[PDB]
């Protein structure tokens, strides 16, 4: 996955 | 409803385009991700890998690297640098 994919889902 | 980042973290957020000193949790997370993205601290092949050695982010995290897939160190830094 991309950095954005991983980051956007922190705390989900 | 909002938190106040301690100075070391606020400078990093400002450098990512944050304005002000009071933010929501998601706001803090957004600018922090933009900081990492802009400065391209993540690896191109393993994008969950972030190398922060030699950057103020690494000095604040107490690490030369971390994985977004195991955010514990990130959340630990936030608990130490965000005030309700």
Swiss-Prot record, chain B:
Induction: Down-regulated by cisplatin (at protein level).
Associated disease: Bone marrow failure syndrome 6: A form of bone marrow failure syndrome, a heterogeneous group of life-threatening disorders characterized by hematopoietic defects in association with a range of variable extra-hematopoietic manifestations. BMFS6 is an autosomal dominant form characterized by intermittent neutropenia, lymphopenia, or anemia associated with hypocellular bone marrow, and increased susceptibility to cancer.
The protein's assembly and partners: Interacts with MDM2. Interacts with TP53, TP73 and USP2. Found in a trimeric complex with USP2, MDM2 and MDM4. Interacts (phosphorylated) with YWHAG; negatively regulates MDM4 activity toward TP53.
Subcellular location field: Nucleus
Protein name: Protein Mdm4
Tissue specificity statement from the Swiss-Prot or TrEMBL entry: Expressed in all tissues tested with high levels in thymus.
Mod. after translation: Phosphorylated.
SWIB/MDM2 domain ranges (all copies): 1-84
Native species: Homo sapiens (Human)
Family per similarity comment: Belongs to the MDM2/MDM4 family.
Domain notes: Region I is sufficient for binding TP53 and inhibiting its G1 arrest and apoptosis functions. It also binds TP73. Region II contains most of a central acidic region and a putative C4-type zinc finger. The RING finger domain which coordinates two molecules of zinc mediates the heterooligomerization with MDM2.
Function: Along with MDM2, contributes to TP53 regulation. Inhibits p53/TP53- and TP73/p73-mediated cell cycle arrest and apoptosis by binding its transcriptional activation domain. Inhibits degradation of MDM2. Can reverse MDM2-targeted degradation of TP53 while maintaining suppression of TP53 transactivation and apoptotic functions.
């Amino acid at each position: 996955e991309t950095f954005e994919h991983w980051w956007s889902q922190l705390l989900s | 409803n909002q938190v106040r980042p301690k100075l070391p973290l606020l400078k990093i957020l400002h450098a990512a385009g944050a304005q002000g000193e009071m933010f929501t949790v998601k706001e803090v997370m957004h600018y922090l991700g933009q900081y990492i993205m802009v400065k391209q601290l993540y690896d191109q092949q393993e994008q969950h890998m972030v190398y922060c050695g030699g950057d103020l982010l690494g000095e604040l995290l107490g690490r030369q690297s971390f994985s977004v897939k195991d955010p514990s160190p990130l959340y630990d830094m936030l608990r130490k640098n965000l005030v309700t």
